[model samples]
Target: PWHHIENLDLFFSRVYNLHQKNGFTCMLIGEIFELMQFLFVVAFTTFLVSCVDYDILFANKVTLPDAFLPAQVCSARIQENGSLITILVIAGVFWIHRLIKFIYNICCYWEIHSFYLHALRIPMSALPYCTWQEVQARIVQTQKEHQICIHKRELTELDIYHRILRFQNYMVALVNKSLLPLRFRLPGLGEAVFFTRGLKYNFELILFWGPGSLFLNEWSLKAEYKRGGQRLELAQRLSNRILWIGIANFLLCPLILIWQILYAFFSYAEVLKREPGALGARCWSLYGRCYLRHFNELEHELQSRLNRGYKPASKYMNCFLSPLLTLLAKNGAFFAGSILAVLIALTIYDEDVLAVEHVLTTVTLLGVTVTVCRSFIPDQHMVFCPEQLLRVILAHIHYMPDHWQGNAHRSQTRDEFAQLFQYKAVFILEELLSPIVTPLILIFCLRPRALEIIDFFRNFTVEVVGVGDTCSFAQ
Candidate 1:
């Protein structure tokens, strides 16, 4: 039975990843949607090529050329020129977990900005002094008001001032306790928000809905509460501490235990599939659990709990399992656009088919690329190349001082449009461009006959949107 497992698991894992769901959506369902969308284009292209191929689909006299094959036929040439087409696609699945880890590691801070500088990481030694000072000022003002109000009858202003001082001091101390020791953790952001279902929750990142970081955050909060309050209420604090400990013990430990068991099953499958005997009998025990109690159930429980062990909704890539697919769709779209472009081009060439398919495909691919370009988890946020990013930031400015918002501001009216744009931007640029660009080289430079047309199109592009028209768009 153990021998039945071969390296076939790598192929299965890829299948699993490609079919994985968008977070908050069923993976199977999300994958179906992705597949159907891809299929629609493929079928429509089949129809298009047929229509353009003497306008016949079901007729024996006409058949669409194999548009899909040229990419393979021309692949070797592209590879020689440094095309990283397949490598990037393969790397994406690995990057998603890395992204999740990055999101989780930043939780001790209030915002990601908190630790952007080295000094910031040492922790906030003082409560935001300005905020406390303002509170003190407000208390002084409130005391002055109280004194004025009581003195309307010329009744002691002195008594009113003392009362206001007491009230302000009480208020400041009470509210101050609510703040975290270092950076107040800023009410529901990073892992805190994800754990508590608090504000600033980026719905896109909510994969670990059960609790890994959430339990830990809850534990830390209770410990702080117990330590901060009175010596006499030590009983109450003790009870609270016990309750938190119990929660960490009963709830979190079980989840982790389940995670460990589930991890062993899936990972055993992984190790066996990858290395073919990495775990010995311990691995078979998990495999036995899977074989005895339905493989699908094992997969479902394992898959679900595996994420519960992480901090959900922390990073775009780490959004995990279901939502991570959405990250991959831009990759899918690039794949679709590429295949469609070729199909169209093949109808033009092998069957002589490039011109008509060029426009819509380019526009659609450009949109997809831009979307991925924006959300793409950059390898480094502070690459220390402000000039590079600054150029990018200013590239779309339509006017000086009152600059245009450009593509990033495409009227979605919600923050998600930005994120979607960002994520889409990242996926497509790195994934889509090569497939599309390679064909141009093959059709024009490689094919001697197509060289003339490439010349004509180059001139047309120059004349149409070149330096001549770049500045006049505003008018």
Candidate 2:
């Protein structure tokens, strides 16, 4: 089932195989929708900004049929804006490229779907009831009769996992060894881990897929990178590559930053409006995911474990809320709540108050303020069981610093834990800051570590006959 695959990183293979037809179709539809979603966000925002009549929208003038901007007028306005036209052109090109990739992916998915049904004899309906282990058992059993992997007579569970998570294992190992420039000692924030999607993308680009990346192909590091004799020269070449990549990042910062803002706004705006405290909620950061990930672990497997640990981790951290901060949060929430309540009451009594300039904005700000402050105000009825809660979190997370075992209640321990489970607002802010920080880290931080990275890869990478080169840690 895995042989002759050009792309060795079958990250979604487990999901595709486990759920069969339904999962395959859903993934296809989801990807298609994502492309359309991006277009919708761009088109809608442009129309609202450039095509709408604010006079009618803000109720400054009476509504009339003419109040709706004519198609010609909207088109003319959009056409006159060179920047908007350029943005549209770029977006169109990107969308078309994505559409092509989606089409290609569909074909590959269909092949897997057919394989699951015909070869494995696993019907679509039965997929939900079957565990991955059962599916793997079937694959192994099928391989004996069919010889799916020509190079190997038998297909082991480890071989399947290695195929699915070849790159992911390397990533986990890189994070484990602290080879990436994710950790930084901020001036006042102490040690902080900053790994956003942008940073991760850049890391993979430099190490795996970019023009001058270390990898020669999908499954192997460049031959030049494997030898110790040219270590200094190779490190120098890698350093130069990092510099150029960093420069490219610096040049594209504005566009990337704007996209980040737009994407974040579109994704979170509705959630924030519906639940003002949503941003105050915590999530596992990208760095946290890599840090906590076990070698050869599948995405769903890691997600399930993390999901189980979430509540306990939240409770464990909540147990250490500061008395001083709690006092401040209580008062702040009270003040914000008072303003929000009055605003709500006024809006209820007189709908015209909502029409007043900045009134709605003030109400929203106050509501968000109250919600944020309330998050800091720990639950009064909650029992303090930091040690026990931490243990529960540890059980699922599977990886934690040794010192955190008995000192879960300490502020120092809490501070470290916050790096893993950070505020949604913090996560968003970090992503927004990624474009700017990525270049700086690449130039200043990563460029110097070229030798170390080369050495690490050369030492840790192992060649397997059927699998090509995979991280030794996984083996």
Candidate 3:
């Protein structure tokens, strides 16, 4: 799937072609203006924080009528300025992963430009680090590594099952040995966090739970049609992954887990109707052989699960315990940080040493409250999205037999459309809230100036307190 252009002309042509394909239409110019506006807003907010005194920071125990609702009670707070900048900047973090990809593209494009300059002998400062071909390869390689792509493919029930199984293995391997180079990967987010599930076990769990669940529940159901338990273990294990994914995604794990468990149910229900539960009987015995036995250690259990495989029970577990594990996962950091912020805010609320504490505490709680409430809504983290689902539906349409379009065809297509709209709404809402709260819970803990001071001393010290350093609350 890697594309290469043989000559420099073709390469430069492609780069500019891409850049201008959707040229400075209003969309492009508007975005440029938007970025400028973004900078102005940030600078303006910093000015307000640094210069003007905002009421939330200085006002003590004043309650304004809630604008959200006339009778709705508002939290105790003064007004403040920095929180405004904090809110907008926090919104910008939603673009973190997008920003990373954009930068990569820019680097790739720049290298090509640099090579052009060097070839002209224009007295360039640095040589091209990679040749033209290498740059092309790197761009495509990174694109494929970071995201999924689709194409036409012939698939059967067994083929569907195989694809599902292969994807799971790929997912696990990618976790253990990321496609990204060692230096490119973030610090502390390594194979150990994902594979061993040690310190970041729960963190990994949340990732898979919300963002990386089933590709298409419909495929699982269709693939399970009236076969023996030949692929039961694969289906069962995939189901477990989905179940755990639900847990990581929401505050109420049980509610979220239901959809995925129902996914398994639909697959099972279809087969149960066709085969009279005969396959379940066989899967039951397989479970006894593979999963019923106990292991002395984690490695032993993993070896058993990998080598022998898991049994797909006929019944679903309540998924109640899933959330308990989530508390320890990556989301654990935010939840733990949220609690700490609340406690510290309350402790400092009355302290004369700081006025910012009141604003900090209120905003922190505000962010946390909004996030937990948002989590209750159904949101697809991984497999369910507009582009992927469109791929799935179109692939199915192309491959589907005419008999499928016979009686229930129109209704089914309409249903798929409805489902797609629903997924988009949930997905949009989910993203909107998740990013907001993360900055809320974590920003309060940031003491960048104090951190610089700590690095300056090369050790911790309380003596800098009340010394009019940037760390001082009096400032």
Candidate 4:
């Protein structure tokens, strides 16, 4: 039974959790999510292949429409290569918001160890870390701090976790500063370049999805002022303006041009209004603790209010700002026209075997999948929500300057903090799983890859720090 449990933990904690930048917990969850993501990928891929196998799937039945991604909005030439470009940009933007979140979470996990370590001072850091003698000592100190009698077994992983997190208040405060956004990334994200789909989503996108500031807003005006005067300077200014616009366009290409590619195959996109919880209000609620109760109601109201105020906050996930996505969703005829153009291009290339239906179906599904992932995104990527999460947590904890929040909640369990500690794992898992899972359900129903699909899931774990090109499923 013990062996079975250990193996179970190991299997679930495989690639995703183990490869994580921080601890076993994150890795455990991350691999689960990564696997879930792989499941979605497999499922989606399965959907396409299931209808026809070996003969139909391999023998030209499953038509491959090598659809090119949209060209840059600025240059509108170099096509989407699906390189690190888009991935990294989105990740970066997501992290700028996510920085503080993982930091605090890191502190939470860190405090599980740090607080007790501080309380123990020298003894906590000693040797194998836990002494059976200390275990007895702990039970007397706190009745709720569960202490089971040993049956001659040596110290195990669970023992270390227990000893460290017991009575962790002091340690939590000790590491509080580390929870700060900037400082958190310094150590946790380490020096890894913040490159992922997130970076591509956030930083690299200047025009298509940017605050008008990237072009019509910030740099363009500055350049216009900087180049005022002489014809030589005037020419230089014009040249600079063109170059700036081009650069902005180059950056905007993936975002802005997405419509051009999609416009080719489909007319109307299936768009369901995303609920606030769907937007990570729940996953984000961790950073804001207040969501445990009230935030949901607020978000529920926010979602139901179609005539709600124009929410710039919605841009955190790039949903509202994307002109291309909006066009694909709202303008059916225009999108179909674009698909026809791509089909003509395919015909010109002598790829007459490619059917318009195949091209449309493949691209359309991929586009929708991309959109869902884009809108809500995974929580670990949205560190900005941490500020919200923390505000809410503190609010609920109602921690006075003098004591624990427990006194306020008279019925709260003495091990409430321990339960709270465990909550972090769930918080990370839910956040990471949603993007991967939500997409998978779509793929599953669509029957893209089929049931006997290649199962791919990374446990639900996320690192605020960018770990670049991490290939180690074992990481």
Tell me, by lDDT, which candidate is best: 2
Candidate 2: lDDT of 223? 89
Top-down lDDT ranking: 2, 3, 4, 1
Model 1, CA-based lDDT: 0.30
Q: Which of candidates 2 and 4 reaches a greater TM-score? A: 2
Error of 1 at 101 (Å): 15
Task: Give lDDT tens digits, candidate 2, residues 1-475.
Answer: 5554435345336434436434556667777888889888888878877888888666654655645688889999899999888878877888889889878878777777777787788776777676676777777777676455446657665777887778788889988888988779989878888888888888888888877788777778888877889899998998999889889999878778778878888788889899989899899888789889887887778899999999988777566656898899999999889888887988899778856789989988898888898888888787777668888899988888988888877888888889899989999898899988899998899998999999998899999877789899999
The whole-model lDDT of each prediction reads: 0.30, 0.81, 0.33, 0.32
Q: Total backbone clashes of model 2?
A: 0
- Summarize candidate 3's per-residue lDDT along 222-247 as a digit string, tens digits: 23222344344444444454344333
How well does candidate 2 score on lDDT at residue 169?
Answer: 87
Residue-level lDDT of model 1, residues 1-475, one tens digit each, is 1121322222223222322321112433554564455345434433433323342333424235523235454445334533233432333443555545444533322221232112122223332332323323342343333332312333232322222222222222222332111111335532111111111021101111124211122112122222323433433433333334333333333223322333344335566578653332111121112112211222444434433322211222222123465567557656656766666666577664436657666656765665664455333343343233223423321111132233223233113322312232222222223323332322232233222222221222111111111001111
**Which candidate order results from sorting by TM-score in descending order?**
2, 3, 4, 1
Of models 2 and 3, which has the larger lDDT? 2
| Model 4 per-residue lDDT tens digits across residues 1-475 | 1222222112222211222223335433654564445334433332332322344334433344323222243123212334434543564465545555545544444433432344323233351344434433542343223222223133242332222221121112212322111111336433211111221232223212244321232112223323224324444433343345445444554543333323221221222143323324212222222212221122233233312311322222222233465555545544644665665577678876456557656556656655554443333343344233333445433332233332422223212322222232244443333333322222222122211111110111112112111111212
- What TM-scores do the predictions have? 0.16, 0.83, 0.23, 0.20
* lDDT for model 4: 0.32
Lowest lDDT 10-mer window, candidate 2? 3-12
